[model samples]
Target: SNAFKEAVKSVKTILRNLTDGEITISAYDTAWVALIDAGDKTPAFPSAVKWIAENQLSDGSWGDAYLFSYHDRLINTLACVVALRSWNLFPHQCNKGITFFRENIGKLEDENDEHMPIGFEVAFPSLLEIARGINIDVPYDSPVLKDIYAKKELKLTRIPKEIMHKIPTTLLHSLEGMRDLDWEKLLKLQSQDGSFLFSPSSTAFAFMQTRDSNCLEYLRNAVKRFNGGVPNVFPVDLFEHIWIVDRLQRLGISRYFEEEIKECLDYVHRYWTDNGICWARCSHVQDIDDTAMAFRLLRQHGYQVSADVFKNFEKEGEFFCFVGQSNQAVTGMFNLYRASQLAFPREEILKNAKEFSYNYLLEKREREELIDKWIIMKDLPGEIGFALEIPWYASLPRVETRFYIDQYGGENDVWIGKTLYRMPYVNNNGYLELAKQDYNNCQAQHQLEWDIFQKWYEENRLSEWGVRRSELLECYYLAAATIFESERSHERMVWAKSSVLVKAISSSFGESSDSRRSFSDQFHEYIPGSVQASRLAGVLIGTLNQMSFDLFMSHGRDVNNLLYLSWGDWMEKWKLYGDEGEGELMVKMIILMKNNDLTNFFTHTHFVRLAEIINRICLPRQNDEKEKTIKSMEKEMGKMVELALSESDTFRDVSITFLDVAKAFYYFALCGDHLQTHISKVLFQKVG
Candidate 1:
């Protein structure tokens, strides 16, 4: 416990101290910075030259130390060699780098194009051209160079020269690789921060051509801040702020840093634009991944965000990350799919996004093509699989978290930019360690509660009333998986026991209208007749009394009559029309146990709408008749999401309770057949 608290404090400090983003230095950008010459014919940033020389790996390459990517190592090593050779410094190191490049250049053909760094096709050819001019002994005639050159041609053709010079597109981030241009026209498209699309290499190249003072200032600040090295991108403040919150939330640790998360989201909201936002703030170019994620988180936190922000990224029916993206990024579409699920009624843009992204991800998954260009993590397939398999409406909080803990790669995950890099705050071992410890801790408590629940099932002879032990486990599993906080034991127990009693009543007496009416009459009359009906009624009443007593003991408020009235109302409905009312019953019991002053809100319009939606959602349907019902249920759940998220008449916590309970029902209906695997993983298999 102390360790967990300490971890939380450590992460809190990290979040509070966040600035322009905490990304690892990129040798590629550093070398590009080093290549700039002072007016006096010396290197502008000599320390950058020294950094390239000092950081070469044991295999004579320069790239990420842990994971070996042919693209990352080749691009980084070649750039470092070029910078060192241009400065006429570190000859031995430069020679080793050249040799490594010569030996490894052919291996590039073997690597997946999906794992290639951003703009590598353009940038690498430029590097080769520079190497040839400098008289470096690199393998300029390598076979891989042919495909790279062809790709460069194809990419340059995608954006015509006039358009490239007139607009600020993703091409601005890779200007170092292009041959050419009218500097006067392109300078107008420079970002407000003085960098060419926040890329140090691209900006340095701009300075070398025109000696623009703004470009000079941008490079000076970047070099100084990183101590002669720079990231592939700078001032990624918005990306860092948004994704850190996402990682923490999905990791199940956001509850520990609510104030910090709120501060981060507030910052995101401040910079949010009608045209959406880019990875960095105040940019002319925006990406769907960042904008979609920010939109989802902001709307979820009760901020007023317009769905029209997505209109910019859509063309006809397809959604692209950026206007001139080379390939479709899986994570970008994945995030768009996630954000689209939070749409309100009649949001046509979001509906299109949902359809387009879902089909895109489905196609990719079917082809076994799950790799993303922006990131390489431990399990892309597993992550995408979970999102596709469990729609957001049916995704329970703890269940999502349970799977995410494993899918998260921690520090091992590397991002692809101009070169490979790591964002320490966003993807690190600290967050993973804390998530594992926290999940296992919560899971341990759940197991103990499950043991006590099994004992209660046996003592009550629930199986005699037709409640199977497997059925008991599934009931408790749903409750535990949904409301899985260590402190919310009472609410979780009441949810599980209430579900079991409903099942027992329905299976034992729901065979015919006569049987259902008989049991309902016995339950209401409190008459000791019809031996089976009376015994089942006794178990239900006794369970309700025990739960109400437990609530009174915990909260110092007597709820005996409230519990009787809710159950009596359900029995009345069942007696007259055989309506199960299970959803209404569970919601009432959970909320009654949780809040002291909920009587006035039960009749609220939003609450009534929520109850009706959940009742339809939780209604039992036969397998053969579920095809049409599934589509109708989706519409109903969308309304439930809209109401729960948009309505403020009820307390925020109270509103969320309705959504949470409804999700549990949706989860069971959609994923019931395949839940055994989840049960084993979540309940039995501890995180390593």
Candidate 2:
């Protein structure tokens, strides 16, 4: 037990760096985490703010993955900027970071780069929503005054390509920006109860007798269950909050009457680990990006978020995590934060969450005897993708056992059920999310991953072995793919704007066969590290690569020459080791600059500093005692975390992770130094 304590303590150095938020220079999740870990105020990260502002591109906007260049940027910038304002807005250090983001709004433009009238009906309305939520003052001539909502740039997205291909033409066109459709098509989809229905969830529940409000009812009920309700009973969580708060409000019933929303928030705020670190709930586990976004948005809406609950976890100068569900009370309050004047917090929390979560995985991963883990549950109903599934007893160690996570079933999972999956974006996974821990579905991947998990436990948690290699791969696929899917699930990503994957409806599931009937059918295809998302792509690809390599290696697959990378390769070290070249470093750098502060980006000094560290700690030939090796690793990680701190002033609630923070810091700190030396000694000074 104490061994883990020491290991956890080792992360303190990383906490000091704020590197967890911006590792790999991309990802909204990483940025969000940093916001939470920051000081009671959100402006603790000047470098990060400045970097985002400077790198916004000449077009005045940026997006991680699956984002329409215009729409995504506005939402992201708005949420992040507003969040940082809670802490004096640190305007001087931030370099008008807020204003820069505001100016960078991606709007429909002509060839000359001048903004044109909002062509797609959907864009103006949505933009207006984001702007209004944050109190953005609209110019007298703002296009929002022009009405008539319609489909929009749903095609220009990159992530969750599968969702675009599915759904009715009416739904797709509006989501994509046809701009001349009736609003009822969209609003009619909402339950009388109140809440936005998402993808496959919306798609899956297509043939329901529950009528128009059926899906909303399902989501709202789930929110109640999430607030600590017993199974088989109508959840009466007085404090339980719902993403579609208005859904219930429309019904004249919500937390005001139930009061259970605070219970969830209490769970998160009350349990600040041994360290003053708490989290935001996605569906499960405390997410960094969500947390950061939530903090800023909450503060913007006049909800007070004290730093007393989040501290010490802040070395994540530039990172964020996209975790699932949590204890934060007040259902859908996260949206308020997003719509508030503290918009920048969205970016901050997103960046920080990515860094922190990535680092958490890096530092916590324990490997041992590798086992083949996979399974195929074909007999499972297609719409079995419903909200919940009960499982039978099993011989496997559940994923929940080894992870320190808590998930929320309401807004994220439930709202998703009513909005998307329930509408038309059918995927078997929807039902799987609700599965009981022991239920044995005849799914191949689930079986395989479960087998490996079991072997891991059999080895006293020291080994990593089992059967169903492909199953494990599926899990990795789902985990990373889910992030991408979430982006476009709200609406189909328009293809004309961004050329990437197109969303799809279930062609084989029975749920779609009947006009008005029973359950099933539907699935989402996911590929890891799809270049479409650009920055956020790192972790997704890395995770996929690690799993793919392991699975291939388990099958005795040959992996040699070791240089070039391929999807089928095995035994490759580093998640992206086999595939990455030095060129990608530039993109990573751009991200680093945006996340860190222009100080690291304008020069090559940070890169140089990292090279030195690699040289110092990487004595590949030195196979010393395990204790010494471990100590060396810790020391190296320690240095990296510290470098992150010096580069940016980061704090808790909005911070980054240790391992990734170390890696990112090493890259920037090293490069920044080397570039500086090279410029002075060789380029200008003419020294040897």
Candidate 3:
């Protein structure tokens, strides 16, 4: 608990320090900034040029220092070499850059083109041209350049001059590497902040070509803001905002930052547009990556977002990150599949997006191609595997967060743009530390609760009443995991105990019609404080009264009558039909404990439908193991989650507790092996 408190303090410091956005420097883009010339043709940002010279890798590469990608190293090396060569400054640094490029250029042929920087095909060629003009001694005619040259030409053909000048496209982001751009038309398409689609290199090129004062201002601010270095993309306000929520939510540390998460989402919601959004706010070009991500988080949080936002990215039954994008992004399609599963009743576009993204991720995994286009995370495959294996409908928050804690790379994870970068708010060791500490701390609480639960079961001799230890543990695990906060001990215990009682009754008197009728009669003339003639019925009633008394003492709510009546009805139904819709009894007990107006909720038709849907989805045991049944249940669970999580005024009286009950069962059925590890960690492990 002290460890978690310390971790909370550390993470809050990291979060509070997040102003504008916190990202690491990009050497490739910084090189472009260094290349800017003053009136006397001297380097405008000599400090930037110094950064390029000093930050070169020991291998003579100028890319990510901790990790090496052939494309990342090669492109960064070339850009820095060109910047220094044009100024004829630091001949030694330029020589090392050239040597690094010569050694690594051919390796690009072996690398996956998907991992290439945003506009590598175009940008690499432009670097080569600059290299040749500077008379830099290097392999100008390498075979690798031939294929890349053809790719650039082909991509250019796809986006002809007509299309480039007509409206905004992804090309604006890579304008620095492009040739034959009409300056007049391109300047009109510049982002509101004066950068070319928020790309520093592109704005540098625009400044170089046209000497636009606005481009100078954009570059000047970036150079000053980052202290002589700039990111490939600037002002990643929306990207940082959206993903910080995602990272914290998936890491299970969001509960600690409710106000912060709301502020982040509110910031994102303010910039959210009808045509969708790109990584940065107020951009001319938007991608499926940001749009799909925003859609899911916004919709899940009850913001009014249209599913139609995805229509732009889908074409001819295939979804793409951008219109002329080269390869699929593993994280992109992963989020799309996640968002799609939250589809409303008949959001057909999301249905198709879900199917397409599902197949895309599956094929990518089958071929062992899990490398993401946008990011180099610690475990992209692990993240994708968990998503595909356990669909969103069944992904319980704590379970997802527990597993994501390991998969997330924390401070080591890097974003792949022209060069590697880090979004500190989204990827930091502080969040991870808090998550691990918090998980173990809550787990400590759960272990305490489990001790109490086991004691109650043993003292009551629940085994004599027909509940097995495994079933009791399973019931408590589900509750402890779903309603895991320490303060919700009553709800968690009531849920577990109620399920145990239901299982005990079902297993005890469920066999013959005579026994079923015998148990049914005990509840038929049920009085609040009556002692049953049968020992089993007496134990059941005693369990019910103990729970009611606990609730009354805690919440001052006399739910004794409500609990008995609800259980009486449930036993009557179970006596007729076995484990069908029995979860309804657990749901009713929880709702009544929170509020005593059980009559309206119990009688509400929507509440009845919600319970029946949960039962049908959760009740089937052996049959659900089949793939066919799993899928059918997934569709139904999707409907239930959408209804439960989505905002609605129709069932104004019903609490969202109905949905929480359904989600618990979904997690129970979905994560079987993984759940055991969680119980071991959350319940048994100490915070270290």
Best TM-score among the predictions, by candidate number? 1
TM-score of each: 0.94, 0.19, 0.88
Summed backbone clashes in each candidate are 0, 231, 1
Give per-model CA RMSD: 2.4, 30.2, 3.9
The residue-by-residue lDDT of candidate 1 on 372-482, one tens digit each, is 878988998999999999999888777889899989999989898988899999998999999998899989999998999999899899988889888899899988888
Query: What TM-score does candidate 1 get on C-alpha atoms?
Result: 0.94
Clashing residue pairs in candidate 3 (N, C-alpha, C atoms within 3 angstroms): 443-682
lDDT of each: 0.87, 0.28, 0.79
- Order of the predicted models by TM-score, top scorer first: 1, 3, 2
Residue 531 lDDT, candidate 1, scale 0-100: 73
Error of 3 at 219 (Å): 1.7
Q: Tell me the tens digit of each residue's lDDT in model 2 across 276-302.
A: 221212121233323443343233223
Question: Any runs in candidate 1 off by more than 4 Å, and if so which?
Answer: 110-114, 142-158, 324-326, 510-532, 595-600, 620-624, 647-650
What does the lDDT read for residue 262 in candidate 3?
71
